[PDB]
Amino acid sequence: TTCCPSIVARSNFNVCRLPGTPEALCATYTGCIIIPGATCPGDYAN
């Protein structure tokens, strides 16, 4: 599951993913994170 720290970060995440870039690369490039669970925390609420 991915979790993002803000709106901007999620929007940029989603653009990063359009060409098929691995989630892990899009995470370091945006500040979003990948977790094994399904419940994103309150500081990664977007």
From Swiss-Prot:
Disulfide bonds join 3-40, 4-32, 16-26. Its main location: secreted. One of its GO terms (cellular component) is extracellular region. Gene3D superfamilies: Thionin-like (3.30.1350.10). The keyword tRNA processing does not apply. Keywords: Disulfide bond, Plant defense, Secreted. It holds the Pfam family Thionin. One of its GO terms (biological process) is defense response. InterPro entries: Thionin, Thionin-like_sf. It is found in: Secreted. The function of this hydrophobic plant seed protein is not known. Belongs to the plant thionin (TC 1.C.44) family. Two isoforms exists, a major form PL (shown here) and a minor form SI. This is Crambin.
